Amino acid sequence: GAMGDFSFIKALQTAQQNFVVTDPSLPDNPIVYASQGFLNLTGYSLDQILGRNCRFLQGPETDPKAVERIRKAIEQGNDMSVCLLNYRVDGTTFWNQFFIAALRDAGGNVTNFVGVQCKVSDQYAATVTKQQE
Amino acid sequence: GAMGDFSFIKALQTAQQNFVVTDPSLPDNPIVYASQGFLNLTGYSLDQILGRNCRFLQGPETDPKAVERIRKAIEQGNDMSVCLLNYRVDGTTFWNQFFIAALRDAGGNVTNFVGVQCKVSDQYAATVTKQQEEEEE
Ligand SMILES: *[C@@]12=NC3=[C]C([C])=C([C])[C]=C3N([C][C]([O])[C]([O])[C]([O])[C]OP([O])([O])=O)C1=NC(=O)[N]C2=O
Ligand SMILES: *[C@@]12=NC3=[C]C([C])=C([C])[C]=C3N([C][C]([O])[C]([O])[C]([O])[C]OP([O])([O])=O)C1=NC(=O)[N]C2=O
């Protein structure tokens, strides 16, 4: 039973609270801050996270074509998105649809990236990957 | 058959988020960084934003009780989820659902705030302010 019973108000607030911030000033664009939401999704504690590129969430069966695409996406310094196979701290798997935006200072330089992460269904993942031509 | 699930909506909802960063170390906690999404939604250019407390988005029909709760949260270094009525640069209004995330330095002082903002519906706003007040009883 799912059809009537969707709580879009909690869903939306949850949406706002799963994120990381990265610092492309630093080498390999590490995560430097992370939300509690992100902790709960991934299962990793802060100490295992900050200082790294969140490509650590990737693993064996992650699509490299997709990874390639999103790195290409981020390269000019702009706002793109992607769905990727991601591994929890316990090795379990989940689809991660996430959206990356650049933060800019008074010089119009990208100081930081912010990324909101959304766990999504196999069905969703099929869809978004099928639409690749 | 009937294809789809909740995660499709969640995905759509997270795609509507945009971001700012403020600096409470500075006077009056001004915006210092912003994403393109924040400019589009509000209508202001980057130049017109950076350096201002983002209360400039507020106006005459903004719930003052809500604004004050925000101020309390900020003073205490707490996170805060809230829906406000904001005004674009052109005068038009919209409901702003946003999450304020406290950020600390190594001394454990608040040095930044991260803001995730979101345009939401009259129905959303209605329901949410309605869910408040009850909470106050
Ligand atoms: C990670 N989300 C995420 C969040 C931000 C703000 C940024 C800038 C990147 C991501 N990534 C992508 C990752 O860091 C990396 O850019 C890609 O792997 C492609 O580049 P490489 O160097 O590996 O070729 C995220 N990747 C994820 O797997 N999950 C996320 O949530
Ligand atoms: C502004 N969003 C927003 C984002 C962050 C990260 C922070 C710290 C604050 C906000 N505000 C609140 C506003 O700046 C101000 O701090 C409050 O009004 C506090 O009370 P006072 O009485 O000092 O004004 C935002 N307010 C909005 O209206 N819209 C935003 O997007």
Residue numbers in the entry:
A (entry chain A): 234 to 366
B (entry chain B): 234 to 370
Paper text:
Aureos typically consist of an N-terminal domain with unknown function, a basic region leucine zipper (bZIP) DNA-binding domain, and a C-terminal light-oxygen-voltage (LOV) sensing domain. LOV domains are a subgroup of the Per-Arnt-Sim (PAS) superfamily that sense blue light using a noncovalently bound flavin cofactor. Photon absorption of the flavin results in formation of a flavin-C4(a)-cysteinyl adduct with a conserved cysteine residue, which initiates a cascade of structural rearrangements within the LOV core that are propagated to the domain boundaries. Here, we present crystal structures of a fully light-adapted LOV dimer as well as of a dark state LOV monomer of PtAu1a.
To obtain the structure of a fully light-adapted PtAu1aLOV dimer, we set up crystallization screens of wildtype PtAu1aLOV under continuous blue light illumination and obtained colorless crystals overnight. Their lack of color is indicative of formation of the flavin-C4(a)-cysteinyl adduct. As expected from the MALS measurements, light-activated PtAu1aLOV crystallized as a dimer that features an assembly similar to other N-cap-comprising PAS dimers. The two PtAu1aLOV protomers are related by a 2-fold non-crystallographic symmetry that does not apply to the A´α helices. Analysis of the contact area using the PISA web server revealed a buried surface area (BSA) of 1524 Å2, which is similar to that observed for the VIVID light state dimer (1342 Å2), supporting the observed dimer arrangement as biologically relevant. The main dimerization interface is formed by a network of hydrophobic residues on the core β-sheet and A´α. Superposition of the dark and light state structures not only reveals a variety of light-induced side chain rearrangements, but also a significant change of the position of the A´α helix that is released from the hydrophobic patch on the LOV core, thus exposing the dimerization site. Compared with the dark state structure, the C-terminal part of Jα is unstructured and the hydrogen bonds between Gln365 and the carbonyl and amine group of Cys316 are broken, indicating light-induced Jα undocking from the LOV β-sheet and subsequent unfolding as suggested previously. The formation of the covalent Cys287–FMN adduct and the resulting doming of the isoalloxazine ring at position C4a are supported by the Fo-Fc omit map and the 2Fo-Fc map. Additionally, the highly conserved Tyr266 located on strand Bβ shows a light-induced rotation out of the dimer interface, which is prerequisite for LOV dimerization.
